Amino acid sequence: KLESPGFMVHKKLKSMSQSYGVMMTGVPAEVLGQMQAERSIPSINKTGNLKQQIAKEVSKVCHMMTEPTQSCGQASNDVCELLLGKIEAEKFHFTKYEALSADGDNLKNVLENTAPSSTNLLIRFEIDREDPPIVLVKTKNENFNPETAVKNKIYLLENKLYFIDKMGNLFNLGPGKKKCTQLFNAIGDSAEYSLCDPFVLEEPEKPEDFAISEIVDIFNEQKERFDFWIGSHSFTIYIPQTLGESPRQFYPYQAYFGSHTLQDWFVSDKDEYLSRIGIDKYIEKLAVLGKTTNTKERSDIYAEFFSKRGREAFFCAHLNEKRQPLRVKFKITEINPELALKNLQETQEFIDTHPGENPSDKVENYRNRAKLAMTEHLESLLDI
């Protein structure tokens, strides 16, 4: 089979990732271990047993390296870095996302206006869910420390009404000290109260329910100060240049934290499986995920596209239903296959430098050196 240089990017990336998993980041093992040691230092109690807490922290990290701990964002970053190169990946990273139009037209048209034989496209997607606060916590100010408080809640003190958002930003919601002192006393003593409860915002009876409904209306009137959106998935699609009049093919790439790595994805050939749906039908279903209000339909598309292969049935079932609305945004660039292939071969050669007859021996050698570098870095930093 003769294939374009563009397709050879995809084939090379897939094969290497299948074989070498974590080594594709190109990060030397001694660098990875020192970063894990530094990341776990805040976890260690200076007064306690040092030689003991070290062995525990190195044991956690050892556990994790055989668990699926690669995040979707990291997987996407790694693809963009390999395909675009370090410098142009950072440009792309500061490009703004465009919201996918209602039918993917804006994205279908970009594809319509590019010659399958001339161009190699990399599309990056992000998927956010709308996550507004749903609890109000009444606390006296003595035992309110804004640095520690749980996020995405509304807090009512005697003299302030605060919204702590997902980033820990503290928003004063507007009322003065007198109005807060009145709201604070009208409400009873639960820990938390709900702010979404029906016939508790529309048909209030109890004075406490009026107070609560009153805070809800204050929050809603100023809702555009806030961003309730939070990321839930990140992934890329690669569309290599075609040969002759061969049809145009897309390959989706992803990891999903706690479910599977980019390597697991490729080993399961779910990229090939989804490839067969065709880029139009894929984008079409992506669009549906964005506008729908149908929970079953929402959970189904998300699971079909983004679950570990073989778990389409329950990835988003029950507790893991996709209850909140989703929006789909994207951003697209072009690829110089010769740069991409050159970056993959620099990775391959960094991998070949590792002792080990099989790919699986190299990965173990990489993991062991990372473990050993993490221990020693932890020892040196703690004076053992």
In a 3-state reduction of DSSP, which class is residue 334?
Answer: strand
Backbone angles phi, psi at 5, to 5 degrees: -55, -30
Q: In terms of domains, do 221 and 247 share one?
A: no
Three-state secondary structure call for residue 319? helix
Experimental technique behind these coordinates: X-ray
Beta strands in the chain (DSSP E): 98-99, 121-130, 135-138, 153-156, 161-164, 170-172, 192-194, 229-239, 251-253, 326-334
Percent helix, percent strand, percent coil in the chain, to nearest 5: 50, 15, 35
CB atoms within 10 A of CB 128: 19
- State whether 287 and 269 are in the same domain: yes
CA 200: distance to chain centroid? 35
C-alpha gyration radius of the chain: 25
Same domain, 53 and 116: yes
Q: Are residues 114 and 71 in the same domain?
A: yes
Among residues 228, 254, 277, which one ends one of the domains?
228
Do 70 and 185 share a domain, yes or no? no
Q: Are 235 and 316 found together in one domain?
A: yes
Phi, psi of 171 (to 5 degrees): -105, 120
Q: Which residues of 24-52 are buried (b: 16+ CB within 10 A; e: fewer)?
A: bbeeebeebbbebbeebeeebeeeeebee
Domain boundary among 228, 245, 279: 228
Domain count, the chain: 2
Residue that finishes a domain, picked among 194, 211, 228: 228
**Cα–Cα distances in angstroms (integers) from residue 78 to residues 15, 70, 143, 274, in the given order:** 15, 11, 44, 21
Same domain, yes or no: 299 and 165: no
Same domain, 246 and 139: no
Are residues 218 and 256 located together in one domain of the fold?
Answer: no
Q: Are 315 and 259 in contact (CB under 8 A)?
A: yes
Tokens (6 digits) for 295: 């929970």
Distance of CA 48 to the CA centre of its chain: 35
Judgement on whether residues 196 and 214 belong to the same structural domain of the protein: yes
Stated resolution in angstroms: 2.5
In angstroms, the CA 348 to CA 346 distance is 5
Domain of 346 in residue numbering reads as: 1-131+229-384
Looking at the fold, whether 120 and 245 belong to one and the same domain comes out as yes
CA dist., res. 55 & res. 270, Å (int): 38
Residue 62 and residue 195 in one domain: no
Q: Any idea what DSSP says for residue 71?
A: -
